[PDB]
Structure 1
């Protein structure tokens, strides 16, 4: 059904070109899942807030270690929370407010291409999604 994005972001047709190869040449379900979500419409890719990401990695038993959170979609910040934790995040887009907040206090932000060269198989990555209902 969906096997070609409706987008015309030329760089998203290069990101898909990287994850079409990865999906069909590795045995990981992270790649097959990532490729599918690069096809989804803008409506189906909700913004995922920083605080929601901060809660997910530091959830219940915490023990965040150094796992990388991955989401296809934007990662908007949450000024309603002051202290952001250390985070390694990969996403299509950030917001200049959010990306500064991740960078200023803690780890680093990544695009989907820098995650792939680090964890092509999805090695130790949390794949999250924003609240769909909206």
Structure 2
């Protein structure tokens, strides 16, 4: 379920792979190559990331969150433990209904990977993140 093509049968994942196949081939961005590689991965190799972890990772140590978009090829779940959500711009394959509502109602924007490719076709000013693969 990797390497050449995705094993997934979703036609909309196949369209996203189509878009980033072109971007990874007709640009010199390692971001587009990295996104394409992760689009081929299985559900087990694309662990979800939480709203809390995105907020923590962006304002980490030196903080200086600014307005860089956060990209994760996977699901952005919600952390109900945290009470206040900052203003975040996140691009992800999927958002849960709780995560999407909390980002929008108090914060910024939720994007899909094709909306991100139009804003940052080279991936510039993006914070690409991963989930903890150790389950």
Q: TM-score range by the shorter chain?
A: over 0.9
Question: What is the deviation of 1:109?
Answer: 0.1
User: Following TM superposition, where does structure 1 have runs of at least 4 consecutive aligned residues deviating by more than 4 angstroms?
Assistant: none
Match of 2:37, SS state, is helix
The answer for the alignment partner of 2:22 in structure 1 is 21
Structure 2 residue ranges without an equivalent (≥5): none
The answer for the alignment partner of 1:9 in structure 2 is 10
TM score, norm. by length of structure 1: 0.99
Matches of 1:7 and 1:131 in 2, distance apart? 22
Question: What is the deviation of 1:84?
Answer: 0.5
Matches of 1:49 and 1:118 in 2, distance apart? 23
Question: What is the deviation of 1:38?
Answer: 0.1
Question: What is the deviation of 1:3?
Answer: 1.1
Match of 1:73, SS state, is strand
Q: How many residues align?
A: 134
Instruction: State yes or no: 1:73 paired with 2:74.
Output: yes
Matches of 1:16 and 1:106 in 2, distance apart? 29
Question: What is the deviation of 1:61?
Answer: 1.1
Matches of 2:59 and 2:84 in 1, distance apart? 13
Match of 1:34, SS state, is helix
TM score, norm. by length of structure 2: 0.98
Q: Deviations over 1:101-120 (max 9, x none)?
A: 00000100000000000100
Matches of 1:67 and 1:31 in 2, distance apart? 16
Q: In angstroms, what is the RMSD of aligned CA positions?
A: 0.7
